[PDB]
């Protein structure tokens, strides 16, 4: 049955080589193992436990009831428990290797190359459509999810993973900053749609901005999402410059960005200045924003109670 299950599992068997009172057992400890063969060995060893538990089901039916610690899924099994079950399957893989049979079917791609950060980014990608629906009905269920679970989840994960995830991942660096871009774009020019239920969106934006792995990678790359960062920076500069039509002239939809956008800008400027990332931080898709932001700060270099925030932003920049 051990071989019949493998045959029925749609796997080809091909002969590649020739099979090489006191018994004389040949040495079989000189053969190594491969990662792909580990899955085959585990699946084959699962068959013995499956065919044993199938009969144990009738045995316990005859008994009338009872719980046994040995009747557990194979994924629960540990090497200590596997020491009594892996031998019967390991003794045949070396046999197959020395007989001459052939079975055909980097490890980062197979493993969690995307990881928790990219899983959260996919969740935010679905939340993009969710937020579109929420804005359409604003102009039911995912709103509570976003305001309850995932926002604290990222707010804590980025805090606990600020180090060792910014200096050794590369693919995640190019997408954490992009996630920061859609997070900044998620909140519109007003914050009434989010309401007072979730003021933590500003703190989560702070935390994400303070953890930008691709400080120089996002500028030295082929600039796929650098357009998004440029758009976000240009929108921030335009929103700041639009305040001269209210503060310097006399209100609505613009005062909400003085408590949810300016602190994020200060945090981003402090993040850039702290590590001396100015070597390569104003590159393709960034000078087009810096050349406008210098004119913007020149324009509002002459502007009540918002003076300390403007001074802090100027100091950070």
């Amino acid at each position: 049955e051990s071989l019949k299950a493998m045959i029925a599992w749609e796997w080809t068997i091909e002969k590649a080589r020739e099979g090489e009172y006191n018994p004389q057992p040949p040495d079989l400890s000189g053969v190594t193992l491969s990662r792909e063969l580990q899955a085959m060995a585990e699946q084959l060893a699962e068959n013995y436990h499956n065919t044993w538990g199938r009969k144990k089901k009738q045995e316990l039916e005859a008994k009338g009831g009872g719980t046994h610690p040995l009747l557990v899924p194979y994924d629960t099994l540990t090497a200590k428990e596997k020491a009594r079950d892996r031998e019967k399957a390991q003794e045949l893989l070396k046999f197959l290797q020395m007989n001459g049979y052939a079975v055909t079917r980097s490890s980062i791609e197979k493993r969690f190359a995307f990881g928790f950060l990219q899983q959260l980014l996919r969740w935010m990608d679905i939340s993009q459509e969710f937020i579109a629906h929420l804005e359409a009905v604003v102009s039911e269920q995912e709103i509570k999810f976003f305001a309850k679970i995932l926002l604290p989840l990222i707010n804590q994960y980025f805090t606990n993973h600020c180090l060792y995830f910014l200096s050794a991942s590369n693919k995640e660096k190019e997408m954490i900053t992009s996630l920061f871009c859609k997070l900044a774009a998620l909140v519109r020019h007003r914050v009434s749609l989010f309401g007072t239920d979730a003021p933590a969106v500003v703190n989560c934006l702070h935390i994400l901005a303070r953890s930008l792995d691709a400080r120089t990678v996002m500028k030295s790359g082929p600039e796929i999402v650098k357009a998004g960062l440029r758009s976000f920076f240009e929108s921030a500069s335009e929103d700041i410059e639009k305040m001269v039509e209210n503060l310097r002239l006399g209100g609505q939809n613009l005062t909400y960005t003085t408590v949810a956008l300016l602190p994020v800008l200060t945090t981003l400027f402090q993040h850039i200045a702290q590590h001396q990332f100015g070597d390569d931080v104003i590159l393709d898709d960034v000078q087009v924003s810096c050349y406008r932001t210098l004119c913007s700060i020149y324009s509002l270099g002459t502007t009540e109670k918002l003076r300390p925030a403007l001074g802090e932003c100027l100091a950070r920049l």
């Binding site: 068997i13 499956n50 046999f95």
Partner: peptide, 28 residues
């Protein structure tokens, strides 16, 4: 719990190329 879900193994007929493997493994 762990309700058994056995895989179909009594339907497939073994080929002639594997009888030698069966006998050799039994002797081993």
């Amino acid at each position: 719990n762990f309700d058994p879900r056995p895989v179909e193994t009594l339907n497939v007929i073994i080929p002639e190329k594997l009888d030698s493997f069966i006998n050799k493994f039994a002797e081993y």
